[model samples]
Target: MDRFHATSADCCISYTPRSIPCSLLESYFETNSECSKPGVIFLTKKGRRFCANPSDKQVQVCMRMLKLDTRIKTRKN
Candidate 1:
């Protein structure tokens, strides 16, 4: 948990998708698989942090608040 910071109310509205490399997080969580795949790890403006699965309702709301919810297809296939 050295790399992971405590979650706070002042947290920023953001996401950290697993596709990208996160060295700091890798060392903090001690592993890069769980809670760091496909979607994101939400971080706040104050640098606080928390993990959220894409299917999580709370995360969905947060994503909407941050305008990061891209699950909705904005373009026609």
Candidate 2:
């Protein structure tokens, strides 16, 4: 019944500084070019979400750990 996040994020103005425990991360992905910020969103085990800097050391490690992918064909319409 969790029909939220209709799609990948549209824009990100800030990157979270909160530390994500290495074990808590469930997945990760990047925002599309539609947004000005080159951000990465981290998904937690309990449905928690946060926007993080794409190159931030922790999230970068998290992205590598999950072996997830990002966007390229996100539509505006």
Candidate 3:
């Protein structure tokens, strides 16, 4: 199996409220600054979850097919 960039991916749609916004990303980066820990990438959509990054490919394809990007992203703050 091919190795993935992110073991888990989260997404937020235009209509949905984000739990982990980009702002938080900046903060997290500044605080921990641990690149060794996998960071999450959020796409804009509903019912979508990208458990595996497309390795350099666009996640949109996975977003449409899985519809998990939106679903899994917003589980609990």
Could you give candidate 3's per-residue lDDT for residues 39-63 as a string of tens digits?
3344333534222233423343433
Quote the lDDT for 3 in model 2: 31
For model 3, the superposed segments whose C-alpha errors exceed 4 Å read: 1-35, 47-54, 60-77
The alpha-carbon lDDT assigned to residue 70 of candidate 3 equals 48
Total clashing residue pairs per candidate?
A: 3, 0, 10
Best by TM-score: 2
Worst 10 residues of 2 by lDDT: 68-77
What would you estimate as the lDDT of candidate 1? 0.43
User: Could you give candidate 2's per-residue lDDT for residues 18-58 as a string of tens digits?
Assistant: 87765787876777877656677788888987788766678
Per-prediction TM-score to the true structure, in the order listed: 0.36, 0.66, 0.19
Mark the regions of model 1 whose C-alpha exceeds 4 Å error after superposition: 1-36, 68-77
Ten-residue segment with the worst summed lDDT in candidate 3? 23-32
At residue 48, give the lDDT of candidate 2: 80
Of models 2 and 3, which has the larger TM-score?
2
RMSD in angstroms, candidate 1?
12.4
Worst 10-residue lDDT window for candidate 1 reads: 22-31
TM-score for candidate 2: 0.66
Residue 45's C-alpha lDDT in candidate 3? 39
